[PDB]
Design a protein around this ligand. Structure first.
Ligand SMILES: [Mn+2]
Length: 286
């Protein structure tokens, strides 16, 4: 038997209508289009407090190869995360309870060695293809690449990295694809836990003095959590990241097009190809 691990954040879902409506679109399309071989099993990890754990379990009964549904206690993971992720919530969430928004950063240390690879996924997603096909992207990783991630399709990191770009007008940091580095979107993340444990460079980038060192270089104080950490790391060391094709995460949010970046927005938003996963980020319908 071969295991395939998926992780989803499912917090504060109790009496939350828009979140439950999102999860219905996400989990339905995921399971309706999923097709695995008889010998292999799909594992669905959810991190939820006692309240939302009920909401999830009740929703999966309507929708359910073997597929094990695992539930992770929010507090247990938060308590485990905090001593490892404290030095970077003052930089990427510029207090204790908000350590769970950095789960992806230290997924390898939180998850058991029994699990080699996991895909963290948002709930504002729609799945247009089979999810087993995404796992194939792990094979396209270079040795020394730890994370699989799609690029950010909004000029978010123009404004975020403003001061660095003001000092380095030639830089690619914040520039649109393909020549520039637009940053990453954390909606769909292929986390190679095995590679994350084995990489000395990644092990050191998680250390306090290293986070500080690099954040000060870019004058970085963000608000996007784990996404900001990966994005900043991807500026110094882009070779740690296997950049997914945009079709794996076509983000639909057009906010910045109407709030400051009308001119350059398209260079970031552009994505030609048959969509495999839609990400209705910022409450955008699909
Ligand atoms: Mn999202």
């Amino acid at each position: 038997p071969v295991d395939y691990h998926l992780l989803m954040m499912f917090t504060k879902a109790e009496h939350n209508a828009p979140l439950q409506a999102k999860a219905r679109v996400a989990l339905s399309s995921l399971l309706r289009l999923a097709k695995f071989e008889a010998h292999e099993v799909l594992n669905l990890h959810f991190v939820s407090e006692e309240a939302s754990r009920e909401v999830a379990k009740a929703l999966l009964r309507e929708l359910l190869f073997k597929c094990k549904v695992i539930f992770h206690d929010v507090a247990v993971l938060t308590d485990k995360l905090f001593p490892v992720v404290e030095a970077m919530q003052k930089y990427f969430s510029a207090y204790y309870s908000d350590s769970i928004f950095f789960l992806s950063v230290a997924m390898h240390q939180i998850m058991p060695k029994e699990i080699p690879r996991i895909i963290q996924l948002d709930l504002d997603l729609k799945y247009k293809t089979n999810i087993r096909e995404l796992f194939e992207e792990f094979d396209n990783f270079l040795p020394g690449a730890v994370i699989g991630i799609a690029r950010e399709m909004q000029p978010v990191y123009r404004h975020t990295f403003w001061q660095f770009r003001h000092e380095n007008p030639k830089t690619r940091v914040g520039d649109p694809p393909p020549e520039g580095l637009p940053g990453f979107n954390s909606g769909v993340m292929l986390l190679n836990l095995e590679a994350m444990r084995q990489s000395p460079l990644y092990s050191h980038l998680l250390e306090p003095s290293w986070v500080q060192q690099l954040a000060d270089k870019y004058h970085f104080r963000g608000h996007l959590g784990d996404q900001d950490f990966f994005t900043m790391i991807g500026m110094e060391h882009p070779e740690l990241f296997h950049v997914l094709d945009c079709t794996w995460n076509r983000q639909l949010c057009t906010w910045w097009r109407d709030h400051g970046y009308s001119d350059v927005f398209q260079a970031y938003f552009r994505c030609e190809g048959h969509v495999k996963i839609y990400h209705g980020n910022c409450n955008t319908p699909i």
